[PDB]
Ligand binder design. Structure first.
Ligand SMILES: CC[C@H]1OC(=O)C[C@@H](O)[C@H](C)[C@@H](O[C@@H]2O[C@H](C)[C@@H](O[C@H]3C[C@@](C)(O)[C@@H](O)[C@H](C)O3)[C@H](N(C)C)[C@H]2O)[C@@H](CC=O)C[C@@H](C)C(=O)/C=C/C(C)=C/[C@@H]1CO[C@@H]1O[C@H](C)[C@@H](O)[C@@H](O)[C@H]1OC
Ligand SMILES: CC[C@H]1OC(=O)C[C@@H](O)[C@H](C)[C@@H](O[C@@H]2O[C@H](C)[C@@H](O[C@H]3C[C@@](C)(O)[C@@H](O)[C@H](C)O3)[C@H](N(C)C)[C@H]2O)[C@@H](CC=O)C[C@@H](C)C(=O)/C=C/C(C)=C/[C@@H]1CO[C@@H]1O[C@H](C)[C@@H](O)[C@@H](O)[C@H]1OC
Ligand SMILES: Nc1ncnc2c1ncn2[C@@H]1O[C@H](CSCC[C@H](N)C(=O)O)[C@@H](O)[C@H]1O
Ligand SMILES: Nc1ncnc2c1ncn2[C@@H]1O[C@H](CSCC[C@H](N)C(=O)O)[C@@H](O)[C@H]1O
Ligand SMILES: [Mg+2]
Ligand SMILES: [Mg+2]
Lengths: 250, 250
């Protein structure tokens, strides 16, 4: 193991808190608070303290995507839409740091208020799920200042981290990046997924990676297929774990 | 910031839990549970969750001592006497791993049961302190299996970590190392300090480092001075923070 490999391995174990193994919130299908290795490994629990809920398999995927882009010379920044406490974005910034990359940015996009209240404009599938109901139960609303604080604890808050606070329908169309190498979508709903595909995906470079964290949710999956059909996108959808998938843009 | 530097920096932040900032036990002069940055920085609190209580200044000192020995070709292993949850030894093993050192071992010596009960054989200063009384209050007794589990969580449990379970007066005289490059003493009492200086210090290589974690405790300081006077040791005692000192063996 080289210094870089050790750092990034430890950074994954730290943002997902395999080190101290915090309890999960009891919500959804999780009936007990105890830390379960297999659940944290696959990002299936709702950590009480950890900085990311995506788990080790999806952290490994993010590493693969960012490293492949760097190795192949795919131009552009990294954007995560839906960041919670910031752990996955912290990890992304750590990857760039490990390779001393000075000319790419990690964009951190969130409401910083949890899921939005349902309105009449919402897709019927989104209305039925009403994700907003879960905000407090899994401690989702996390302020911009809290996320910035978290980056600082790792020594990774600097000007290669830029924040996009607001609802995606508002922030994405005019977000000030020109190109993306990795687009990581983690907003769960048809609405959030369609907002980001519509307004950010056209800036994803050829050879770049589009990661759909929540593909197991029917509303998210519906947005993905509607978008791909509309644009004639046939790039193979590759499964990461029981939740996430990705494709590589050609 | 190279891979190695980033890894060791994160490792220090992780074993001391600057990342998630756990509460302290309320004991001694600490009257409130809150995490206080300045106290964790100087190793002055009693972490409820963190794997080491020595803090960042003493972790930095340990890094300096191990790196200097490696740089200067000082032969031998690393021994810590008094390891608690294992954080400082985990860090030591991480340093060797970062530099791909395959021919040195980290020895992890502890009762794995906390401070010993006082008897009439104890030095009067040890008897007056009666450190045993604090075992539960700071969660000091930590089993070998727990310490091994903690190493595993960082990916650092391998054949270059060897354990010496028992009281120092029993384990040190025949411990199966031949030479030390760094001897880190963290047992607080006159007795533990004198046991280890008596039985381990002769195996410290010239150019090696003797670290006294608890020099601020009068009983510990008494043993250090008695031992140095007896052996005619005059190497400068260099202060680290409000607790620890070290010297380099001529
Ligand atoms: C705590 C927040 C979390 O809530 C949840 O997980 C809530 C879910 O358990 C949800 C309730 C499930 O619905 C219920 O599943 C049960 C297994 C069914 O009951 C059994 C028994 C039975 C007899 O009914 C049988 O017929 C039937 C087949 O199975 C339920 N049946 C009534 C049908 C079914 O209702 C689910 C489908 C399964 O996983 C429904 C579909 C639409 C879905 O996937 C929705 C996801 C949601 C709402 C996720 C949020 C948001 O969490 C996010 O999840 C992502 C995947 C993560 O990556 C994170 O982004 C996370 O964000 C915090
Ligand atoms: C929780 C375990 C911890 O307990 C503790 O810290 C307990 C100590 O606060 C202890 C109580 C202090 O004694 C008390 O000090 C107070 C400051 C005095 O009160 C004031 C007020 C006054 C009016 O008395 C006046 O005279 C004057 C202003 O002092 C107290 N007076 C009553 C005199 C005096 O009692 C202490 C000296 C100062 O720190 C005494 C000397 C001998 C000492 O250093 C003992 C250390 C011990 C026993 C440490 C253990 C073990 O902790 C270890 O500490 C190491 C340094 C760490 O690295 C760890 O290894 C840790 O192990 C877990
Ligand atoms: N329409 C929308 N606009 C902006 N943010 C949204 C949104 N819908 C959901 N969110 C945000 O999406 C996030 C989903 S959870 C994100 C998990 C995170 N990637 C991790 O590493 O753990 C929440 O932080 C929530 O505030
Ligand atoms: N005489 C003795 N023999 C063996 N172990 C002892 C001892 N006296 C104290 N100990 C052990 O010394 C340790 C003191 S605390 C050690 C702190 C540790 N270095 C850290 O990094 O946080 C305890 O684990 C206790 O069990
Ligand atoms: Mg998700
Ligand atoms: Mg000490």
């Amino acid at each position: 193991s080289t210094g870089v490999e050790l750092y990034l391995d430890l950074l994954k174990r730290t943002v997902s808190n395999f080190i101290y193994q915090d309890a999960t919130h009891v919500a959804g299908l999780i009936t007990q608070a105890a830390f379960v290795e297999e659940a944290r490994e696959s990002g299936e629990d709702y950590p009480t303290v950890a900085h990311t809920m995506i788990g080790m398999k999806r952290l490994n995927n993010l590493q693969h995507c960012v490293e492949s882009a760097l190795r192949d010379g795919v131009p552009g920044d990294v954007l995560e839409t839906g960041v919670w406490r910031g752990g996955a974005c912290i990890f992304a910034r750590g990857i760039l740091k490990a390779y001393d990359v000075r000319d790419r940015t990690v964009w951190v996009a969130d409401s910083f208020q949890g899921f939005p209240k349902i309105t009449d404009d919402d897709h019927p599938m989104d209305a039925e799920m009403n994700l907003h109901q879960y905000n407090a139960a899994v401690d989702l609303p996390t302020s911009l200042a809290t996320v910035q604080r978290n980056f600082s604890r790792y020594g990774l808050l600097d000007d290669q981290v830029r924040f996009l606070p607001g609802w995606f329908k508002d922030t994405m169309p005019t977000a000030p990046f020109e190109r993306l190498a990795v687009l990581r979508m983690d907003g769960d709903s048809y609405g959030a997924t369609m907002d980001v595909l519509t307004h950010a995906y056209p800036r994803l470079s050829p050879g770049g990676f589009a990661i759909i964290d929540d593909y197991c949710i029917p509303a998210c999956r519906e947005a993905v297929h509607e978008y791909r059909d509309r644009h004639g996108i046939s790039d193979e959808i590759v499964e990461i774990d029981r939740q996430g998938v990705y494709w590589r843009r050609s």
